[PDB]
Design a binder for this molecule. Structure first.
Ligand code: BEF
Ligand code: BEF
Ligand code: BEF
Ligand code: BEF
Ligand code: MN
Ligand code: MN
Ligand code: MN
Ligand code: MN
Ligand code: MN
Ligand code: MN
Lengths: 128, 128
């Protein structure tokens, strides 16, 4: 994918955002911003420019499933890639996320290799 | 749901197809056919008339994940309900099926109540 692709990294814990930002850097993507919840994330997205969202699920103010659904229903950003990265691993919840339009799903804790594979699967599926 | 709804039950072992067939009858669905692999299944699905697929994962010729992907990518049956019923219980398998478009996912062994619950969950989601 284009290395200038602008990522939004969403999680309510700095440590988790830090992990994903560093990994993205390793993969050659330095155009990365952070958000600490779904509202913060929507505020940044509507400022424009973003080409990929990586999001946690359990967060205050607006959780990640709501964020995903909000993105998917919004005609301005309905096709924005959204990769869920979350400790949530219950079968019904994994299905709920896919059905809400998740581009991919990663369970914490995850390895660098897993994140890289998940991103590339999405890049390819979407021809990026 | 409509008791005439036609089901296709896909598994490479007769015993499991037999379990599902009998459960569906108990629930009032007698319009039920069987297939022994993904290819057998697609042959029947393309004969037309099916309203619901219940499918195993591990099968020769074409496995259930390939079967699901094929169904979902096909213009003529892309929204066909597909309930996975499989011994594959790893989260990475569940994710792969969910992301591929599974309507639901039940892990073997399963009780009659679980199958009924998950079928009804799919009926409600699709307004059937
Ligand atoms: F972490 Be961001 F700046 F809200
Ligand atoms: F808080 Be997340 F869902 F891991
Ligand atoms: F088992 Be089926 F009839 F192919
Ligand atoms: F063989 Be199946 F996936 F249970
Ligand atoms: Mn913190
Ligand atoms: Mn969280
Ligand atoms: Mn479930
Ligand atoms: Mn047999
Ligand atoms: Mn038909
Ligand atoms: Mn099998």
């Amino acid at each position: 994918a284009d290395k200038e692709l602008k990522f939004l990294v969403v999680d309510d814990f700095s440590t988790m955002r830090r992990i994903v930002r560093n990994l993205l850097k390793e993969l050659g993507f330095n155009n990365v911003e952070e958000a600490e919840d779904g509202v913060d994330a929507l505020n940044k997205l509507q400022a424009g420019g973003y080409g990929f969202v990586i999001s946690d699920w359990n967060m205050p103010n607006m959780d990640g499933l709501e964020l995903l659904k909000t993105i998917r229903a919004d005609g301005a950003m309905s096709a924005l890639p959204v990769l869920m990265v979350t400790a949530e691993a219950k079968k019904e919840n994994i299905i709920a996320a896919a059905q809400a339009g998740a581009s991919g799903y990663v369970v914490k804790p995850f390895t660098p290799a897993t994140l890289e594979e998940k991103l590339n699967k999405i890049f390819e599926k979407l021809g990026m």
